[PDB]
Design a binder for this molecule. Structure first.
Ligand SMILES: *[C@@H]1O[C@H](CO)[C@@H](O)[C@H](O)[C@H]1NC(C)=O
Ligand SMILES: *[C@@H]1O[C@H](CO)[C@@H](O)[C@H](O)[C@H]1NC(C)=O
Ligand SMILES: *[C@@H]1O[C@H](CO)[C@@H](O)[C@H](O)[C@H]1NC(C)=O
Ligand SMILES: *[C@@H]1O[C@H](CO)[C@@H](O)[C@H](O)[C@H]1NC(C)=O
Ligand SMILES: *[C@@H]1O[C@H](CO)[C@@H](O)[C@H](O)[C@H]1NC(C)=O
Ligand SMILES: [Ca+2]
Ligand SMILES: [Ca+2]
Ligand SMILES: [Ca+2]
Lengths: 335, 380, 453, 177
């Protein structure tokens, strides 16, 4: 599956590259998150600007340039080639949606960009861009520990690596953030060890190693105690993406989630929700686990009138812009 | 000059001093006007009368950023008399005579160094070549040659023989292919790294850089713009490409942008057009940053009016250079040895190097003298 | 503290300012003379030698010669244009054969005149691409070439050209895919010869060879005799490119529009207005254009980009692929790239891009029923043993150029252009140049001699 | 509607699509109804206003070409002026197996199918095929050439040369160990 074609940005300036490296780079301006930069003609150019909400590290603007299309997501709005658009916006090859808890931009054969709109932002890239990319997401060559931080044969540090991939505005001179002093707190109560190493991610231990995630959990624990679950959610995403099936680690206290009345919050539910518009969509799907709201098995989602999830036998039909409740009939002159 | 006769234009040529230039730290316009880009990091022999070692203008181009194609000019080292003399103009304005700091002006061995304005430095020599070096907003170089040296020079700026196909003649007797391949034969130090050909336009990187550079550099080719007066004389397409490439690639986008616009203006004024008032809503931080008591001027076409000069003449003001713009004292004012700008009434006449205050009657050698309006008069 | 003959040099003992390891006698800096105000310590060859740049020591009379980013050992030879140089004592000694001047008129109006100047001019009327009919005496001149932009299916963006090759009293109109002849003056033998050079009509005049791609690019190659005595839109061939914008009245201008407007045949024709930048006009093509034109930066043209400067060619490609918004896009991109292809072909390289996905060239077409003479050669033979030229010799030997040629076997060793086939015995051409099969009377019969009676 | 959107292409479009009414497609126009194919051709040539025009016209005409091929005919339009198809490309230095056939063989003795039989015997269809001589009678798709002996295809369908180990070696039998 999406083994090594994923990168992400989460929590307190935590960057996970394509080949598994995690680091922290507390920048506060624009950076080349990824760019087709080892080819005759560029295909994609995705950048992030990271700012602050009071104190929480957030992404304040993303600019994805791809194949003559400019997509700027910021301020809860999306700009397509300079024009605001209402989600979802679909065109040949490109589709952008408010799907789930995020804003997702999928450019077919190019990339998949998930953006929760506050902190996280995840890139899936095609295998064909192996070794031809460069940015905070890494080189996509498959070797984690040897080729990212070696510029002109000199091994360099996360601050250095995140500052090399910098890009100022036309009239802007953003500084470089200085190294943060030593850490404290750690995982005292063991919450990171209790959860991350808990049963919920058992097989996830067989796929994605949690050492960096453990450290990031501790570091976030040094930050506010209402923001420690970003690392957990990111580990769930990564375990799902490597191929494994995460389990529901959430509890009414562990960053609880709320969903509509008929609709439940699941970790690793099928991404193709069966909806009695296409009640057998989930038949031969090919897509890994996805977190979000779902319906209990047996009852499909009702997208025709948005009445929650309904049983297969009680949901409406549609004909020519008309919605028909169950029990209704309409007769044409011939049928 | 062309006369309308015989149903045609009968054209004769007045002698024309050739003009090399390095603009943006990367682009080079040679004597044959073969514009080419050079992204190198070494000292390059900008020009040299390659029969002898009479003069040798050197330029040190230095990489200024993350990208290998981010260069700035950093020095101009006129070697002379086969290396016996070396006038080195840096990028901050510091002028080193034989590797020793030397303020400006300086007049010795027929060499005259002076600043027409705060933006430019003039290194005039009697050997034939004149250097006019720009410091504001960044470092650019211009070279003028008395046409006598036609078809004799070597170096980056080409042999000056009115042929654009021979400009890449190397020392091996063949025309080189591209810019960088030609330049890497003229490096000063064997240890330098060879320049590399650059296809990737930095303009494609940032959309905000895109729109900024486009909206400003488009002021060149606008037929209603101040620059239109030179369009019918100089084709502004290379200058627009330079402005685009600079601003997109320049970390200080405004600096390289205004450098490109200044370069276009200065080239056109070299051809004999007085482009004026082109900084509308652009590059005005170069209006304001002037030294105190000075002021901007668009047509600075002579020496700088000085109290010493009006008192006892000056070798400086006997040099003809293309009218550059920059910061100077306004007309009717002069800068004393202190450098402050005062009217003529406040600055003194100087006799034998003695400060003789204005409006002061004195006795000397059986004579009575007066200092009226900075002017010295003596009677008896 | 070194190993090979080059030994360490330290600046601690020497007085400050000596030329150190940076000013090392080298295959390049032996000549220019090194400049450095700061000595640096390093390993330097013993006196009498230099370094190769890689830590060796070589005598000064075997230093490799560098040309176009390459490096050549002494004893190696290279070909520049039409001549060949050899590397000796850090120099090139080249044969002194004259090389034909070249004018190139292609695309939406790009011109590369004889003197190497480049510009763009979008003209719509008839423009004198060359002539000897400019001088204090016009009548000692011989030839004249006019071109104008044909649209092939509409009245819009250009799709092809129309050439008028006058030669003294003869005339040849090149349009619509082939040639004609409107010979009006004295009726002697042709002062020209016609050949099917790959995808080109080539017309020679023993000192002036015109090659037409049959759609929109014209490459004219002149002998050195005509130097300084021609004019039009290919300059005046004087090895002085600054003044090549010399109009009808020889008032050198700094503008392309006036220079083009000067050489229109009929003064009644309206002057072309300001040309408009294509990509700005139609932004929605630009991306595609770049993706199409990026072929010039890819490894297909990696080698040639070091032998031929491809900046202006790329700008031309992008402009043309942006401009052709009314139809026929592949032809625009194909010819924009093919101008660079011919530049590479003439320079030193037999580059073959032309992939089935990108600018394909049907060459199986003239292969009848499994016959496999017709093959695509990226550089055609200098002369063709054509049906019209049974000798096999040629007057203005053009070098290789793209297109497909027949490998005519000994059993059928005559390439016939009027049927495009390798055959055994040729037919006949009359004065006007029409063809007949042998054994046919002409408006005399056709025989092994030809038209005889 | 495409032509209404971009009238300035429209004329060109018709000139390009008129190939259907010409003597090139004289015979087939009586074997296959070509009103709708022509309408599609013109609409496609009108629509492709963002680049790649010849491909649009080529495929619009080639659908009709295949319809003629399937009906009863072997029609060969494909002029060097009109929708050329570079088929000399796979010819190695004069080797001339690769020839353009307007109607191909029903089944190809390919590298992957050494038997020469096929499951769904398709009729002729445009494209250029190699006249693989008896000396080199195997058509290899991954390299597009006539060769003497084939290599091996794994379960996923990747190809290797004989004697090369698979992530067992390759032999006349195939992948064995
Ligand atoms: C986002 O945009 C809204 C208006 O659409 C504005 O009121 C708000 O201040 C912006 N910023 C945030 C953080 O919501
Ligand atoms: C990956 O990129 C490096 C960088 O030069 C190159 O040396 C290596 O061969 C490449 N390998 C692959 C498999 O792309
Ligand atoms: C057609 O449907 C309407 C709506 O239910 C119904 O009233 C009518 O009787 C139907 N026509 C028949 C049954 O013929
Ligand atoms: C000018 O140059 C000449 C020749 O080198 C020299 O003799 C003279 O001293 C210099 N200065 C003046 C003022 O002539
Ligand atoms: C050539 O022109 C000159 C005047 O420029 C004239 O005197 C001479 O007679 C002309 N010669 C011929 C052969 O026309
Ligand atoms: Ca790596
Ligand atoms: Ca020259
Ligand atoms: Ca000329």
């Amino acid at each position: 599956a999406h083994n090594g074609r994923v990168c992400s940005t989460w929590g307190d300036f935590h960057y996970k590259t394509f080949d598994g490296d995690v680091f922290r780079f507390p920048g506060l301006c624009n950076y080349v998150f990824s760019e087709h930069c080892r080819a005759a003609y560029e295909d994609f150019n995705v950048q992030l600007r990271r700012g602050l909400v009071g104190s929480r590290p957030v992404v304040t603007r993303v600019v994805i340039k791809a194949q003559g299309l400019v997509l700027e997501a910021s301020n809860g709005s999306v700009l397509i080639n300079g024009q605001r658009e209402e989600l979802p916006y679909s065109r040949t090859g490109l589709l952008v949606e408010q799907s789930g808890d995020y804003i997702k931009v999928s450019i077919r054969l190019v990339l998949t960009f998930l953006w929760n709109g506050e902190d996280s932002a995840l890139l899936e890239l095609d295998p064909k861009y192996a070794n031809q990319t460069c940015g905070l997401c890494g080189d996509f060559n498959g070797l984690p520990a040897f080729n990212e931080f070696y510029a002109h044969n000199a091994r360099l540090t996360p601050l250095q690596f995140g500052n090399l991939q910098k890009l100022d505005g036309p009239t802007e001179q953003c500084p470089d953030p200085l190294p943060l002093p030593a850490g404290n707190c750690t995982d005292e109560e063991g919450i990171c060890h209790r959860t991350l190493l808990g049963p919920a991610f058992a097989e996830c231990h067989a796929l994605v190693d949690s050492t960096a995630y453990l450290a990031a959990c501790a570091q976030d624990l040094c930050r506010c105690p209402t923001c420690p679950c970003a690392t957990f959610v990111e580990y769930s995403r990564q375990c799902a993406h490597a191929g494994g099936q995460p389990r529901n680690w959430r509890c009414p206290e562990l960053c609880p989630r709320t969903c509509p009345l008929n609709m439940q919050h699941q970790e690793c539910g099928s991404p193709c929700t069966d909806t009695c518009s296409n009640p057998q969509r989930a038949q031969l799907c090919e897509d890994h686990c996805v977190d979000g709201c779902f319906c209990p098995p047996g009852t499909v989602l009702d997208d025709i009138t948005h009445s929650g999830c309904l049983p297969l036998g009680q949901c409406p039909c549609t004909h020519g812009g008309r919605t028909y409740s169950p029990g209704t009939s309409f007769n044409t002159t011939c049928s | 000059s062309c006369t309308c006769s015989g149903g045609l234009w009968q054209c004769q040529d007045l002698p024309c001093p050739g003009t090399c230039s390095v603009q943006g730290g990367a682009h080079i316009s040679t004597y044959d006007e073969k514009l080419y880009d050079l992204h190198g990091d070494c000292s390059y022999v900008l020009s040299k009368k390659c029969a002898d070692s009479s003069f040798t203008v050197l330029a040190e181009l230095r990489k200024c950023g993350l990208t290998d194609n981010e260069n700035c000019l950093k020095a101009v080292t006129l070697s002379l008399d086969g290396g016996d003399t070396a006038i080195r103009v840096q990028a901050d304005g510091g002028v080193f005579l034989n590797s020793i700091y030397t303020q400006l002006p300086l007049s010795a061995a027929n060499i005259t160094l002076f600043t027409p304005s705060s933006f430019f430095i003039v290194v005039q020599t009697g050997l034939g070549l004149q250097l006019l070096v720009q410091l504001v907003p960044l470092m650019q170089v211009f070279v003028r040659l008395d046409p006598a040296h036609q078809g004799q020079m070597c170096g980056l700026c080409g042999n000056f023989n009115q042929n654009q196909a021979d400009d890449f003649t190397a020392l091996s007797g063949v025309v080189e292919a591209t810019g960088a391949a030609f330049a890497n034969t003229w490096k000063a130090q064997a240890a330098c790294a060879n320049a590399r050909n650059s296809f990737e336009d930095p303009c494609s990187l940032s959309v905000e850089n895109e729109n900024y550079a486009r909206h400003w550099c488009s002021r060149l080719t606008d037929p209603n713009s101040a620059f239109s007066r030179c369009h019918s004389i100089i084709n502004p397409k290379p200058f627009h490409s330079n402005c685009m490439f600079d601003t997109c690639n320049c970390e200080r986008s405004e600096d390289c942008l205004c450098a490109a616009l200044s370069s276009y203006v200065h080239a056109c004024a070299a051809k004999g057009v007085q482009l004026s008032d082109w900084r509308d809503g652009v590059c005005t931080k170069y209006m304001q940053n002037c030294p105190k008591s000075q002021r901007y001027a668009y047509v600075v076409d002579a020496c700088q009016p000085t109290c010493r000069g009006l008192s006892e003449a000056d070798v400086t003001c006997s040099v003809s250079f293309v009218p550059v713009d920059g910061c100077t004292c306004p007309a009717g004012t002069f800068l004393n040895d202190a450098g402050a700008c005062v009217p003529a009434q406040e600055c003194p006449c100087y006799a034998h190097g003695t400060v003789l205050a204005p409006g002061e009657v004195v006795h000397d050698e059986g004579a009575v003298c007066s200092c009226t309006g900075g002017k010295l008069s003596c009677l008896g | 503290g070194c190993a090979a003959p080059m030994v360490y040099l330290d600046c601690s003992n020497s007085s400050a300012g000596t030329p150190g390891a940076e000013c090392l006698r080298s295959c390049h800096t032996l000549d220019v003379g090194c400049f450095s105000t700061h000595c640096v310590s390093g390993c330097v060859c013993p006196p009498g030698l230099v370094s190769d740049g890689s830590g060796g020591c070589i005598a000064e009379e075997d230093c490799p010669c560098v040309h176009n980013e390459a490096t050549y050992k002494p004893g190696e030879t290279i070909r520049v244009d039409c001549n060949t140089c050899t590397c000796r004592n850090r120099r090139w000694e080249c044969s002194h054969r004259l090389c034909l001047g070249t004018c190139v008129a292609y695309g939406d109006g790009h011109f590369i005149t004889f003197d190497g100047d480049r510009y763009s001019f979008e003209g719509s009327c008839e423009y004198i691409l060359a002539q000897d009919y400019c001088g204090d005496n016009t009548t000692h001149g011989t030839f004249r070439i006019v071109t104008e932009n044909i649209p092939c299916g509409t009245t819009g963006t250009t799709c092809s050209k129309a050439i008028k090759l006058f030669v003294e009293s003869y005339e040849l109109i090149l349009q619509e895919g082939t040639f004609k002849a409107v010979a009006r003056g004295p009726g002697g033998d042709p002062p020209y010869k016609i050949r099917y050079m790959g995808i080109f009509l080539v017309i020679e005049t023993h000192g002036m060879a015109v090659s037409w791609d049959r759609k929109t690019s014209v490459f004219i190659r002149l002998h050195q005799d005509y130097k300084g005595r021609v004019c039009g839109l290919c300059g005046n061939f004087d090895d002085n490119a600054i003044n090549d914008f010399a109009t009808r009245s020889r008032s050198v201008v700094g503008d392309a529009l006036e220079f083009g407007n000067s050489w229109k045949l009929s003064p009644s024709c309206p002057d072309a207005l300001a040309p408009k930048d294509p990509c700005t006009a139609n932004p929605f093509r630009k991306s595609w254009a770049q993706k199409q034109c990026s072929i010039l930066h890819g490894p297909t043209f990696a080698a040639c980009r070091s032998q031929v400067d491809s900046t202006k060619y790329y700008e031309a490609c992008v402009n043309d692929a942006c401009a052709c918004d009314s139809g026929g896009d592949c032809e625009c991109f194909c010819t924009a790239v093919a101008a660079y292809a011919q530049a590479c072909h003439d320079a030193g390289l037999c580059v073959s891009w032309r992939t089935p996905d990108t600018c394909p060239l049907f060459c199986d077409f003239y292969n009848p029923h499994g016959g496999c003479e017709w093959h695509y050669q990226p550089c055609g033979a200098p002369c063709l043993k054509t049906c019209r030229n049974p000798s096999g010799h040629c007057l203005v030997d053009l070098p290789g150029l793209e297109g497909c040629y027949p490998k005519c076997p000994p059993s059928q060793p005559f390439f016939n252009e009027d049927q495009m086939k390798c055959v055994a015995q040729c037919g006949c051409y009359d004065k006007d140049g029409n063809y007949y099969d042998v054994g046919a009377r002409v408006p005399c019969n056709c025989t092994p001699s030809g038209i005889q009676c």
